[PDB]
Amino acid sequence: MIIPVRCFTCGKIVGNKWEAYLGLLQAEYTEGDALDALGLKRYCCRRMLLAHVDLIEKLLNYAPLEK
């Protein structure tokens, strides 16, 4: 639902790159160039950022249980 912390394969930290990745994408980067800007050179970490679906943004459309 949320960006993983580490790459499943190598263990590189990708948790701090989702927001930067999105900011680069709205900056008219291609996904490949964006992944290059964040330093994801192994295709495992590129897999992590490139195949992520941010479902938490949809789960935050529901009001919480307590106000």
Partner: peptide, 11 residues
């Protein structure tokens, strides 16, 4: 194809 996609930054 998935190796190409991951190395290229596409789907």
């Amino acid at each position: 194809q998935g190796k190409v996609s991951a190395n290229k930054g596409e789907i």
